[PDB]
Amino acid sequence: EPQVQFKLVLVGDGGTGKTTFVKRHLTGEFEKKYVATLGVEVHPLVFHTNRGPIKFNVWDTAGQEKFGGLRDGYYIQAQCAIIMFDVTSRVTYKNVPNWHRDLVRVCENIPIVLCGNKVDIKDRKVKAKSIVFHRKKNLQYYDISAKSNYNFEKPFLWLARKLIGDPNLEFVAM
Amino acid sequence: MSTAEFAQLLENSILSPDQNIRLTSETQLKKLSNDNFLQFAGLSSQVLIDENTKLEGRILAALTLKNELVSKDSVKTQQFAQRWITQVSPEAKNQIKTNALTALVSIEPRIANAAAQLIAAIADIELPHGAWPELMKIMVDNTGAEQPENVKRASLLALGYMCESADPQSQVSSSNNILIAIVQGAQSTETSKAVRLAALNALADSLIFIKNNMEREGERNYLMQVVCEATQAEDIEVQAAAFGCLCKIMSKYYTFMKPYMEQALYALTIATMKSPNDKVASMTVEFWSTICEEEIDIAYELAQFPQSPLQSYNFALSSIKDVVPNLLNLLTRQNEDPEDDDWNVSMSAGACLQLFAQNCGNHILEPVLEFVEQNITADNWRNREAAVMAFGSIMDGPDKVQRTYYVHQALPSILNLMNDQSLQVKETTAWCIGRIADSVAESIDPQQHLPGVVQACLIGLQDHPKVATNCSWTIINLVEQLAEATPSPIYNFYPALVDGLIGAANRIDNEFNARASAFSALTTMVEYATDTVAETSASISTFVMDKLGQTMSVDENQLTLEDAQSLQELQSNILTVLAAVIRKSPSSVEPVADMLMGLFFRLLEKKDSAFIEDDVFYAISALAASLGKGFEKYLETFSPYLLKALNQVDSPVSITAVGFIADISNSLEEDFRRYSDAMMNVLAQMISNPNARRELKPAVLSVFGDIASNIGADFIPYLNDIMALCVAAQNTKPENGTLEALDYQIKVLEAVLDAYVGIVAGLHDKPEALFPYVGTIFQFIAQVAEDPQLYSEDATSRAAVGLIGDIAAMFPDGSIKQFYGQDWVIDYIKRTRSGQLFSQATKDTARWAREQQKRQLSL
């Protein structure tokens, strides 16, 4: 059934919190345990805007190589992406350029948000200052916590604004 | 299986609405590649070139074969190479490659792009082996200027993929200069922008691969000339890509850059930096950041290796005259719209100005401060905001004397800008004040400037939320830096600051994080609170307890997902402050511990407590530690949460649960009897749990020590079980041979000590109870005597030598005298009394052990 919707592919190292971020948005539940995603899981997230609903069909992909499934095959027809890493784990940050490259080789020009997750944890190893990923046109960075809900909506508001071409789109109380 | 059926599988994997149809197809594809790779590889190549298959399926056909040829994991990389080399027939390999080269030249770009990835993957496997020797000629021929646009573009893209993918070179032959092929596609004689882009991007992908070429002046001069021309192209995306290449070249081949910087690169990057086009200026700013970043890195390397043949050319340092004023001018291209949070050229300019300050230190001051002095009172807000941004941007790099001095001059005018009409001026001013607090807090004279800074922050908290947020951040810096001064001037302002922060925390929403940051600031206020400002801590705890109350008497059934998640963010914020209050001022909440525990239990009782459970468990545990005996009223209703926590033997929470058992045993002291039977049986099952994480075993073994020392004769029923756990633990060897595995055995052994010290202290009046185990205790003391990693720890030896003494004191009737005439015991006591190796406390305890040992032998 016709509606305003976008395919969003969520990628990033295992453990960085991709599935946890999606479930909170989906049901409000915070998942404590690590249960690695097998290939991909698809869920729709609906946001109510001042131009009515926007739907993101979120493909939550596996970050562990062993469980990758179709890998960059899942990116086919993606209209936007989120790359996630763990602010507490330098290796997950150092893999961001590769996740980025894998995305652009399949989706030449799409809007992408880099999310540095788990900022609720005392000592970060990746400081928000030193991020340079978001310096170009269709790219953006936010600190996020899937657990404290810091900057909960920002990635989706920024994506929606880019995809619709309206800089003053808001997420309104339905 | 036929082409069409395989295409159907591919298409259904990613296009079917039915999620089970997708899984099923994905599973069958993987099964096929496993069972019969030869067939799977052929079929994939056939779907890639088939006009009757949907686009998405053809792309997936290329991608999926590629992902069975190449991998992130270098073990699978070798298996994939060998499976291609050995299982696919020469005929099949030839067809597959032929089909790939046919897709490459498809009139559909997205098919061509996915073909390029497939070609790169095959090439990664075959080129080291000199298989596919036709490929390099085909790619070079395809990039000839006269070839069709799509053929040139797709082949440049493939060459680039191929080059960034070949192993740290070592495979790299003469016929077909790859460099000339790529650089020619970048020439201004190319009509097609798509081809020049493809060329410049392929060139960037190939820079590590073409190293030997770059080290030949002729080839290098030519490449630099073409890339530099490209920067001056009409098309903005071609310009971007040209500067993209320059950045990469500067950072890989810095060592060859002096001649080009002097001939033409310098003057053009300066000119381009004044461009009225924002994107064009950013590109050139990027290049100068890369230069700065490199030279900073070179300086670090040269400090660690002073004889290095590597030399800085100090490009950034030499450029200040020209670059810095142009950067400063770029600061006045801020975005008008306060709701736009995108990166723009003015932010690139600020970032680069900061790198310049770090690189060049004091040399940056004159041009920046000329600018600040000229613009801080300009009529245009853009010039006023650039002024403070420039000033804040040099608060790191120049020495402390210069920064302190210029802060003293600027600060009054900076503080006055908190009254500006312009939102963006106020927002940057609060940020600037923050930077001054963070890097040069002693520059803020306690008498002349601190009152003004505090007032500025207080005004800021009441302003636009974006300004407020920066004020909360600036307050945190002020307090973290000034709370440690010895005559500490900040505590004079705690009440004013706490009051402003509470007001900010009371905002109706969390626009621009104004509310969340206020709660972080409040956490800092609490963390650094001294006794002289105890009243203001009480304010904070009263405020957040009341706010936590509000958040829980909302109409749950009418709350949207959006509403609830905001509410839960606020509860997390609140708990951070309550944790700090409990850690720091446990006394300023115990008068209302009854209502605090009320809130905590209600929080835990809700389903959807998962996000906050641990926070609350930590909080209660730390509160329990402060209440002592006063916490016993909450134990019954806290019980199942403790047990849930004790049973998550894989979570860090169980470690603190064990700690909690230790705390209430120490506070209830003799009254811990009531709970001892339930606690012991739970601790017993945790320690003999296979899945218990490593830290639990010793934590448990120590807490047996605690309990026994608090509970005296009431420990006797557990004595026999616990002693068996200790014997078993003390005879366990390291799991392997690593440092890690050995350090853990010792951590276990230190925990057995704790158990035996506690038990001996506990059974002081009941020696008969300890008597049967004295042999086993000495077996342990013998291990302490034997292992350096135990005996050389001053604490461990003092405890061990203490046991020798204390056990002797317990049996004056001679019943254990035989343990005291052994060679190893005498020598251990002597050693513990001897060198400089152990401390006076340790030596005095050895002296006592020596006296008790002597008394035993004469019995």
Ligand SMILES: Nc1nc2c(ncn2[C@@H]2O[C@H](COP(=O)(O)OP(=O)(O)O)[C@@H](O)[C@H]2O)c(=O)[nH]1
């Ligand atoms: N503290 C904290 N933990 C998180 C956060 N996000 C996720 N986690 C935890 O980190 C683990 C990540 O699991 P998951 O979402 O499955 O990782 P994925 O492989 O990227 O999907 C889980 O145990 C989560 O509870 C966060 O923002 N803060």
Ligand SMILES: [Mg+2]
């Ligand atoms: Mg997952």
